Amino acid sequence: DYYHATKTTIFNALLNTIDLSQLAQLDLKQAGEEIRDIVAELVAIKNVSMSVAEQEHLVQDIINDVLGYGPLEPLLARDDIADIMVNGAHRVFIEVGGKVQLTNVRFRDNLQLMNICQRIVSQVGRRVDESSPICDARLPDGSRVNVIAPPLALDGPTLTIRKFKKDKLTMKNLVEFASISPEGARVLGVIGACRCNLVISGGTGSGKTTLLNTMTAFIDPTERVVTCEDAAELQLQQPHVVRLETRPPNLEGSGAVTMRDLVKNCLRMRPERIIVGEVRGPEAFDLLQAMNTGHDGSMGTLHANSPREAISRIESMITMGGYGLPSKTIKEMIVGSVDVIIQAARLRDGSRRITHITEVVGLEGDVIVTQDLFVYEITGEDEHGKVVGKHRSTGIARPRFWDRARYYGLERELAEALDAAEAL
Amino acid sequence: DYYHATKTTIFNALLNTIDLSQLAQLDLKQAGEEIRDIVAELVAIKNVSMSVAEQEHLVQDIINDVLGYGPLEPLLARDDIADIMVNGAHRVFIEVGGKVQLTNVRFRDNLQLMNICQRIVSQVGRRVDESSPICDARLPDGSRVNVIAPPLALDGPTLTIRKFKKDKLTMKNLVEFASISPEGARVLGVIGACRCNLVISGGTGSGKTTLLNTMTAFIDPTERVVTCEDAAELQLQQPHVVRLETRPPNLEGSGAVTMRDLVKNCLRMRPERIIVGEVRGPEAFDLLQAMNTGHDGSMGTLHANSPREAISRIESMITMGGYGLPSKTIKEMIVGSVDVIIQAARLRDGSRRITHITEVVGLEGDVIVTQDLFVYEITGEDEHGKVVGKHRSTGIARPRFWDRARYYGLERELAEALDAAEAL
Amino acid sequence: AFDLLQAMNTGHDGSMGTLHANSPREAISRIESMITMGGYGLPSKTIKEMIVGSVDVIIQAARLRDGSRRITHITEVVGLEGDVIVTQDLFVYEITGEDEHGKVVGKHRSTGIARPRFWDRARYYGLERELAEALDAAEAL
Ligand SMILES: Nc1ncnc2c1ncn2[C@@H]1O[C@H](COP(=O)(O)OP(=O)(O)O)[C@@H](O)[C@H]1O
Ligand SMILES: Nc1ncnc2c1ncn2[C@@H]1O[C@H](COP(=O)(O)OP(=O)(O)O)[C@@H](O)[C@H]1O
Ligand SMILES: [Mg+2]
Ligand SMILES: [Mg+2]
């Protein structure tokens, strides 16, 4: 029980000796030495039940307060923990083995938690406060962080940290999980090798990035690939790959390199494929240019729950760009540039699927027309509560990209896969 | 009559001795001690008929007016008082037991009332004055304060304090009022425990927020719930509830956080149920996506008169978002997302009943088909003027969610409830 | 206007408003125009349904040719039918002719309705008999 009182006393003593206002003075190593010496001198002057190990641990806690993330360090250190949910300063839950449990972890007060949240979301040049209480970001280590501030969250700052697994899935894994039928897997292989301008839509956590990463495995090793990203997610194996990453604006709101700038410059690097990590704003426009003016095979994911919604949001982003283009101009551009719209999506039981493999056939009137090569048919739910369904081909044996497939000598495999799926 | 004169004289003497302008010198506690000493001294220096009891009363009144929330402190202290409505400095009303009544409470003048309002709204850091005459805020204790300043309010500052009604109706209370037959109550228990996505329709004041709060008593405690609201009304007793709340735009349109933004963010908080306070705008779309993408158990109340009109309203809201989805796409979304629509309604005689427990069976052609488990057949009118009706099960033995009910082991309870309903 | 209707349709029954129009149908059209001016992205049918659900009565006053003012209608928003709002006038001022001084001559007559749309609302407050008597007396002509 003396741990809390000892910590408070040591914090007061450290502030008296080395105050937080002296930041950048007595830096990381200097602080690690000075605070340790001060804690030793205090343990000598001020009697405490803390032993030598306890004194070293108090020095460690001071180090955390000066350098670390507070009581989250024990949790983030562990690897079996998949999610950390803070729900205010006095209730920290953790997901272990797929089940949520309450931990005996407690922040000092909502101010400590609200400062730690700002510290965590500052790693990517982002700030969350009463000016903008909602903040979603992804850390370098490969985890997602969501924060809501006290103005909205009544109970206090709410922090959600999902630590996603490192190793990714291959198309073989997707076939194993029944995510896509093997015939669909062969058609996807043809599409990836055939150099089709495909857009991978989907919902949050639906599998967009994983699907893109599995599709890039079909890229011919001789091609010059350029991958524009925000978090260095993709893991390509080709030898001739150029990896780019946008730079978030600094604290002064200057020096930013938006994804739009990266894509615009990628047109100068003479790449054979541009792979946008995710389309969010005006860069959509530029990406289509790349898809249209010779860089066939360019891929890029976006957030949407169906091909129609994905196309609508592409139009919305292009309009946000402010180029003053009419609606039908944008629709003609989309129809000319995009070939396939693979639709990832999560099902009502939480399991992922590839629900559609669409195809922008053409533009009629003012509405774009598409035909699904595959569709997910849900039949019901099994005794375990999991959604049951099957991937059915619509029978189309002449996709609009047939010429591309033939030019590379893959039309035979495409026809074989489509007719084998049609046999069912 | 001498009480007012003595109080005024003692206040002047205290200001002469202990100046309220001396802030940071003789502060709250020192101010109270000095006020007590000064009142004791002036009792003899300023001959007042007030005895020891009246002397202490005046001491406390000085301590309040100097520091506290003026004459409001008694009203805020009581627990039966639900609302406090001050129209100027002379017409303080209060709501007790559902009845608004005037009270013999007055303020010195409008300046005192405005200062009190400024002190009250300063707890949450907001300020109200002739510069920004309107202030709506939520105090830390759950009460809501609304203040309007003299420039707009002709009669003087207007204050409205709505305390948090901390007692709600349970399901058994709704049964006692003959609002839902006990068989219907147990069917609702099965539906809530079985985590079926449900929309709670109803008209104005028909009592659908209360029904939602009763339904949220069946949520399994181990589930992470996230409730979005415009004004905090639900009181969930589970230990894992996360409470959010929209922020309306200020007078200049900045700092707005719509329910749509909250519901979109909640998809990234890893919830297991999203419980939207009330669906009015485009957020319906997001909510349905939450229902579709694995967050089974999500709820939400909307304003409609019949389940068919509720579905039409959902379609209209989803179209209002401007996502460019055709009608049949939205209808398929609604069919796949919603499972049970519960219809509350307030009848002619001022009574409130639950008139439908509908299930969205599926699509026939271009119109969504529904089947009612329960219906309130209104026969006629009591001679007293009341309306007379009976709850009856439509005879549907196995509801659409029978498999879902069985997966949780509640098939026995559902069968018993529907047999008892059918056995009458 | 939008907010006002929202107030009328969220428990604040009894609210009142005034606008500038010559006929109740013109008043409804101008309400739709204002709500569209709000810029909330609501289609016409949504606004018409909102007007139907919120408003109950529309009292149309007017100033006549001879400068005289007379309440010319007491209309009721009966409900939507297709894409047009239906209305029924409880009272109307029928202009029969002119006086010898150039004045306008007319009479207030009820359209004979006995059960207006707000019959239940009136009954809930113990006024159904007053309304019935008033309408019957008006219909006695
Ligand atoms: N078909 C699938 N089967 C199983 N898990 C999947 C599948 N697709 C994606 N995932 C899981 O989703 C997580 C990554 O989702 P991701 O698509 O990268 O996020 P986003 O779609 O938001 O970019 C990984 O942890 C991975 O295990
Ligand atoms: N079945 C019922 N019988 C009697 N009174 C009820 C019933 N349900 C709710 N009430 C009361 O009526 C009020 C309804 O308000 P509320 O539930 O907020 O309706 P809404 O949210 O639709 O406006 C509540 O204050 C509650 O005390
Ligand atoms: Mg991604
Ligand atoms: Mg309500």
Residue numbers in the entry:
A (entry chain F), B (entry chain A): 80 to 503
C (entry chain B): 363 to 503
Task: Please share excerpts from the published article on this structure.
To understand how different nucleotide states might regulate CpaF assembly and conformation, the structure of CpaF was determined by cryo-EM in the presence of ADP and Mg2+. CpaF incubated with ADP yielded our highest quality map at 3.1 Å resolution overall facilitating a build of the NTD2 and CTD with excellent sidechain detail for all subunits. Henceforth, this CpaF structure obtained in the presence of ADP is termed CpaFADP. CpaFADP formed a C2 symmetric hexamer with dimensions and subunit packing similar to CpaFAMPPNP. However, ADP/Mg2+ was now bound in each nucleotide-binding pocket. In CpaFADP, the map around the nucleotide binding pocket was now fully ordered with the P-loop well resolved. Crucially, HIS box residue H382 was turned away from the nucleotide with P-loop K287 fully engaging the β-phosphate just like in CpaFAMPPNP open state. Moreover, superposition of subunits for CpaFADP open’ state with CpaFAMPPNP open state, including their interfaced CTDn+1, revealed remarkable similarity with RMSD Cα = 1.0 Å. Broadly, this means that when ADP/Mg2+ is bound to CpaFADP in the open state, then the nucleotide binding pocket of the open’ state subunit resides in a conformation similar to the open state of CpaFAMPPNP. This finding suggests a model where the CpaFADP open’ state has the appropriate conformation and geometry of key residues to support AMPPNP (or ATP) binding when ADP/Mg2+ is bound in the open state subunit. As the nucleotide binding pockets are solvent accessible in both these states, the CpaFADP structure is consistent with the nucleotide switch model where ATP and ADP binding in the open’ and open states, respectively, would potentiate counter-clockwise motion.
